[PDB]
From Swiss-Prot, chain A:
ATP binds at G169, R170, G171, Q172, R173, G174, K181, A182, G183, K184, T185, M186, R212. GO terms for biological process: DNA-templated transcription termination. Residues 61-66, 78-80, 108-110 are annotated as: RNA-binding 1. It comes from Escherichia coli (strain K12). One of its GO terms (molecular function) is ATP binding. Residues 48-123 form the Rho RNA-BD domain. It comes from the Bacteria. This is Transcription termination factor Rho. GO terms for cellular component: cytosol; membrane. The gene is rho. Its EC number is 3.6.4.-. Each subunit has two RNA-binding sites, one at the surface of the hexameric ring, and one at the center of the open ring structure, where RNA helicase activity is thought to take place. Facilitates transcription termination by a mechanism that involves Rho binding to the nascent RNA, activation of Rho's RNA-dependent ATPase activity, and release of the mRNA from the DNA template. RNA-dependent NTPase which utilizes all four ribonucleoside triphosphates as substrates. The lineage of its organism: Bacteria, Pseudomonadati, Pseudomonadota, Gammaproteobacteria, Enterobacterales. Belongs to the Rho family.
Curated annotation (Swiss-Prot), chain C:
Homohexamer. The homohexamer assembles into an open ring structure. The chain holds residues 214 to 419 of 419 of the full protein. Facilitates transcription termination by a mechanism that involves Rho binding to the nascent RNA, activation of Rho's RNA-dependent ATPase activity, and release of the mRNA from the DNA template. RNA-dependent NTPase which utilizes all four ribonucleoside triphosphates as substrates. Each subunit has two RNA-binding sites, one at the surface of the hexameric ring, and one at the center of the open ring structure, where RNA helicase activity is thought to take place. Belongs to the Rho family. The gene is rho. Residues 71-75 are annotated as: RNA-binding 2. This is Transcription termination factor Rho. The record marks K113 as: RNA-binding 2. It comes from Escherichia coli (strain K12).
Length: 419, 213, 206
């Protein structure tokens, strides 16, 4: 009866539900087709069908209501919306539309929206008066996000080190510089666990580009939030389509005084798809990357803002270096000074089986006074003074043992005061 | 009624002004489009509309009156000036033009300047006799700019050190060599505070390239 | 059966000749309509004639006229098509008063060469052309009208100053698009608008 709950059901249960209804031969077909078939048969009974999803607008003028469960993949079960409804209710790409859907008549292959009663988890009339996102005035981050977890007390010190190396706030536009095989994937997973635990109210969204199918499944099971990803076998145009879907959805949520945190992986992979999709302008720069090709990633990355009126958009991205490619190096160079917090990883530290492989000297943040307190800020400065003479590798094992025998960061801070 | 005061108004107030006028669906759109829509509706009443900005000339020959509020960004609310008006009043890129603007007729998407009554905060006839900047003879700096602030008495000694390390005068062509993460941004901010305080008469302009929003 | 449906649908005077009737009957009725219209125009009245079809009308005229001893391409004599030219050219706007409006249909791609020669001589004789496309009709999109090919002369007198400029803006957008993609683009825009004025102000937004 309800579209959202039907997709969340297991595929094995989905076949059983359709068999007793009256349908046949639903076992050996894609799950998306099964949902369309079940809704088609259930529509004959005359009962109302509820549907919801993320709305996008095509270039022709009509739009479809994509579902975040299938990573915004086009399917027969997508809800079609006429352009006339767009005039009645001001809608743009990214917003969530929920309402009743009518059975598709002959000649059309998609369900049509009948009546909308919920826009962006709010009344449709109220959503019409929301101020656009681009008109909002950005500000520096001021809401400290405690990345350290005390109740878990796990053997991993990544959360404790991350706060000391570079505090993360709401609306940050930081990037992660991670060489290959340096624990980049687990670094994002640990951050996601703390966000889902310390700040359950904040909306957490994870976007992955050119990731293996088994890596996507593990991310969904581990991260307690909305995870959308595109596999490598999918075309480069699919990567562009999903990338714009995530940011547009986040912007609409920010307009409703909500905080959205986006874990991006990766800018280099994202810029790879953007360069291929954009047509050639007749001029090729160094590395085969056009000037206008990297304009799109700049728009996506720069959207991380702290709204003065209310809410914030936090974007955390990963940058790949020393991958043996030049294009990936040119992409990194233009994305150096665009961030608010840099987190540089070192392959050599990972070669010593010491984790997390974080370069404390290279890592840093801007305007850390607003995030931390007066007492906390001074303690961090004292720690950096001791670390700076030490090398990038010797600093980690020095910090790891100190944090290993201390319960919280406060206990570590008062220990350094003794010396 | 006046273009300059309308852009300085908050976006929240801008929507409310257009709603009572008669316009609709102004909330979910860019601020630049809202200003154009409000002026378009207000133009139907027949009341005169005042506009001003910085004039630039394109390569084709026509120009537009950019606004410094939007960082000179191209928009539908930019005032279009015909090349004929350029011959009547010698104008080049950079000068400020203020005057009445007529409603855009069918076929054009930009407002057109009707009559100009203020050029560079001066009478247009007087601005025509000004000498160009390139014919002026440069000289060394001779007007001392006191960068030190006494009334504030803040804990920061940057203003006091700057005067001792290197005095700054009017017409200086100095440069700052700043490594990354060396307080370069706050260095310019402290200088700006002293200039706006010690010398309010002097015009202060700040230009930033490739900076975060 | 087509004649009977036309009489029931059209609220006016409908006259037609069936295929079984001889070609001389087609000529007799064709001259009857135009001569009747001319007399009404002389009385300060406006007459509108819907002709269907010039190719069919020229077919009967060619057979009725006796052969002059010379046959041109397609078996159509030069004097044979003189009569349709007189009938079609009678559409005039009288300065003193009244007017005669003639709207005709031309058949193309019918598999006959003769029907092609007739169309060629009747290309530049019209004041407005309305070209239909079979490919558009194959897509189940109606009306199958080629917007780029269609046009009119001296449209300034008919439309107003404000209306004329809006049409020019629309043609600028349509021209880059193909003859088929232009229709579905126009159909959806007109579908959600009440009148053409509402459609015109919508295009002004872009
Ligand atoms: N916090 C951590 N603690 C212990 N081991 C880690 C940690 N993070 C990563 N690793 C090690 O890194 C390996 C996986 O690295 P990977 O995520 O593939 O690096 P990259 O993402 O740079 O390719 C695992 O075998 C794991 O043992
Ligand atoms: N005059 C000053 N007094 C105290 N601290 C300062 C001063 N100028 C800069 N800082 C410190 O520098 C940091 C910001 O440096 P930043 O402006 O980012 O350097 P850069 O512009 O070279 O990148 C702040 O955390 C601030 O504490
Ligand atoms: Mg990885
Ligand atoms: Mg700086």
């Amino acid at each position: 009866m309800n579209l959202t709950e039907l997709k969340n059901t297991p595929v094995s249960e989905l076949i059983t539900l359709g068999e007793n209804m009256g349908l046949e031969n639903l076992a050996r077909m894609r799950k998306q087709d099964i949902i369309f078939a079940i809704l088609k048969q259930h529509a004959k009974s005359g009962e109302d069908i509820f549907g919801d999803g993320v709305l996008e607008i095509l270039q022709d003028g009509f739009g479809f209501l994509r579902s975040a469960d299938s990573s915004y993949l086009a399917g027969p079960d997508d809800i079609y919306v006429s352009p006339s409804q767009i005039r009645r209710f001001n809608l743009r790409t990214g917003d969530t539309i929920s309402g009743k859907i009518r059975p598709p008549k002959e000649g059309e292959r998609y369900f049509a929206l009948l009546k909308v009663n919920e826009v962006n988890f709010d009344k449709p009339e109220n959503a019409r008066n929301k101020i656009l996102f681009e008109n909002l005035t950005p500000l520096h981050a001021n809401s400290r996000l405690r990345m350290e977890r005390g109740n878990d007390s796990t053997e991993d010190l990544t959360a404790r080190v991350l706060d000391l190396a570079s505090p993360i706030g709401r609306g940050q536009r930081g990037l992660i510089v991670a060489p290959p095989k340096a624990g980049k994937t687990m670094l994002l997973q640990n951050i996601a666990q703390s966000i889902a635990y310390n700040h359950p109210d904040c909306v957490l969204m994870v976007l992955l580009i050119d990731e293996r199918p088994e890596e996507v499944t593990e991310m969904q099971r581990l991260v307690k939030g909305e995870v959308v990803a595109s596999t490598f076998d999918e075309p480069a145009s699919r990567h562009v389509q999903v990338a714009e879907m995530v940011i547009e959805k986040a912007k609409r949520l920010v307009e409703h005084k909500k905080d959205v945190i986006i874990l991006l992986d990766s800018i280099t992979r994202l810029a790879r798809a953007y360069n291929t999709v954009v047509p050639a302008s007749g001029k090729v720069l160094t590395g085969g990357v056009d000037a206008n090709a990297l304009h799109r990633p700049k728009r996506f990355f720069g959207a991380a803002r702290n709204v003065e009126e209310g809410g914030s958009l936090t974007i955390i991205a990963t940058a790949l270096i020393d991958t043996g490619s030049k294009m990936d190096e040119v992409i990194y160079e233009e994305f150096k000074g665009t961030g608010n917090m840099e987190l540089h990883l070192s392959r050599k530290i990972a070669e010593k089986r010491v984790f997390p492989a974080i370069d404390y000297n290279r890592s840093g943040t801007r305007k850390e006074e607003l995030l931390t307190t007066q007492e906390e800020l001074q303690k961090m400065w004292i720690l950096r003074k001791i670390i700076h003479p030490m090398g990038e590798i010797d600093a980690m094992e020095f910090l790891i043992n100190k944090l290993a025998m201390t319960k919280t960061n406060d206990d570590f801070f008062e220990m350094m005061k003794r010396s």
